């Protein structure tokens, strides 16, 4: 062939933290279909927002919005348990179908995005150039997001484990862990990567007895 | 400057599943220091193996081994709770220091890797070319690894939740979930991505009542 139809920019969705997660890589020949399984961020979460992005930037907000839609009817569950399968499917006509299906409930919702949506030839190059210009900035953002999700997981988890421990955990451990969790929660509210690791460290330091109890149960 | 000292190949470690996780990207100017926080894969895990890799391939086994060492003394904990901070640090002399520290226990272990280790000029190009040749293969591997970790998490989690539920979960739910978990566990033993998703789906399908109980508690 003298010619190939290709994605000029990555395509994906916004994931927790405001980051663009790629489903279809830059430079993919179409037709193509890719899927990934995502989950909920909160206990009892009943819905998720699927926000479709075109571009190469790490902040969702710095990419082109192709549209968004909600999937609801998610059945009560602990966070991170529902399986929310997101499929990006580009046909021979270059139309994009983005679907999200709840494997438990069986509920499906979809957006269809025509081949002319998104960024024009100039902006694809503005985008490419900017992703290059801001590589260091974008990595640091992504590291901060990863750190904040880690802190959050530790926060949420430790709270559940304190609950499950009940009387097994001594007063003095409990008080120390709870103040570490307040400090952590305060830090998850900012954009200071080091402060978050500091508070995650304080928590690791005061949780030893809790971790034994949770492991034993 | 007319010249820049640069990493000719990504540097990283082996993570669960046999995948290379990058700590220092290809083409980084040195000196440089990057860190990421990892955790345990099993309840009560007391040690982790740090395996240092140079290269661009997605299977750990297809990259250059720069050495490995164990960190032990990890205190009993649920899997995914200990904070194991891995730092890669390349100094002005191009020496690499790879350290892993347990934020709870405070234990640290290290490997130091001289600037002449790893792949020579030819092999760096053999490596670059191969990562290109096998892009599709490598992605599929990485998707399979991601799927298997997801299945495993669901397996491990659901087992804990069945335990925590005890009598709240009806006989018929329990029997269905347990047979789905056997089927899942059988599938996690293979390399068949679809079979794993199929068994994760079966589990989502029979776990609705369990998920309610776990969310309520």
């Amino acid at each position: 062939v003298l010619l190939l139809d290709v994605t000029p920019l990555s395509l994906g969705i916004e994931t927790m933290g405001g980051v663009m997660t790629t489903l279809i890589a830059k430079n993919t020949t179409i037709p193509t279909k890719h899927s990934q399984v995502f989950s909920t961020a909160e206990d009892n979460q009943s819905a998720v927002t699927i926000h479709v992005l075109q571009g190469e930037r790490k902040r969702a907000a710095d990419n082109k919005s192709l549209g968004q839609f909600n999937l609801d009817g998610i059945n009560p569950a602990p966070r991170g348990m529902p399986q929310i399968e997101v499929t990006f499917d580009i046909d021979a006509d270059g139309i994009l179908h983005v679907s999200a299906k709840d494997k438990n409930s069986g509920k499906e919702q979809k957006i269809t995005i025509k081949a002319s949506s998104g960024l024009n030839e100039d902006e694809i190059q503005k985008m490419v150039r900017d992703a290059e210009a801001n590589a260091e900035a974008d990595r640091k953002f992504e590291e901060l997001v990863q750190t904040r999700n880690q802190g959050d997981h530790l926060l949420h988890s430790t709270r559940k484990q304190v609950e499950e421990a009940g009387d097994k955990l001594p007063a003095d451990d409990k008080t120390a862990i709870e103040s570490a969790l307040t400090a952590l929660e305060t830090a998850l509210k900012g954009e200071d990567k080091a402060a978050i690791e500091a508070k995650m460290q304080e928590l690791a330091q005061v949780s030893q007895k809790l971790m034994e109890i949770a492991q034993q149960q | 400057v007319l010249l820049l000292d640069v990493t000719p190949l990504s540097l990283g470690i082996e993570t669960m599943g046999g995948v290379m996780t990058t700590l220092i990207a290809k083409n980084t100017t040195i000196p440089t220091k990057h860190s990421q926080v990892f955790s345990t894969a099993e309840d009560n895990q007391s040690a982790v193996t740090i395996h240092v890799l140079q290269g661009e391939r997605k299977r750990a086994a297809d990259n250059k081994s720069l050495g490995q060492f164990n960190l032990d003394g990890i205190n009993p904990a649920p899997r995914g709770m200990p904070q194991i901070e891995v730092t890669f640090d390349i100094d002005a002399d191009g020496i690499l220091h790879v350290s892993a520290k347990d934020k709870n226990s405070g234990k640290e272990q290290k490997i130091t890797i001289k600037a002449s280790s790893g792949l020579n000029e030819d092999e760096i190009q053999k490596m670059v070319r191969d990562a290109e040749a096998n892009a599709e293969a490598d992605r599929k591997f990485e998707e399979l690894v991601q799927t298997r970790n997801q299945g495993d998490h669901l397996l491990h989690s659901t087992r804990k939740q069945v335990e925590e539920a005890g009598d709240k979960l009806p006989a018929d739910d329990k029997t269905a979930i347990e047979s789905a978990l056997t089927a899942l566990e059988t599938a996690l033993k293979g390399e068949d991505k679809a079979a794993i998703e199929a068994k994760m789906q079966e589990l989502a399908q029979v776990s609705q009542k369990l998920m309610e109980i776990a969310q309520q508690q």
């Binding site: 933290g17 961020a41 998720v48 927002t49 | -």
Partner: peptide, 8 residues
């Protein structure tokens, strides 16, 4: 609603 989280 919340954004999806990369499943664990």
């Amino acid at each position: 609603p919340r954004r999806p989280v990369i499943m664990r």
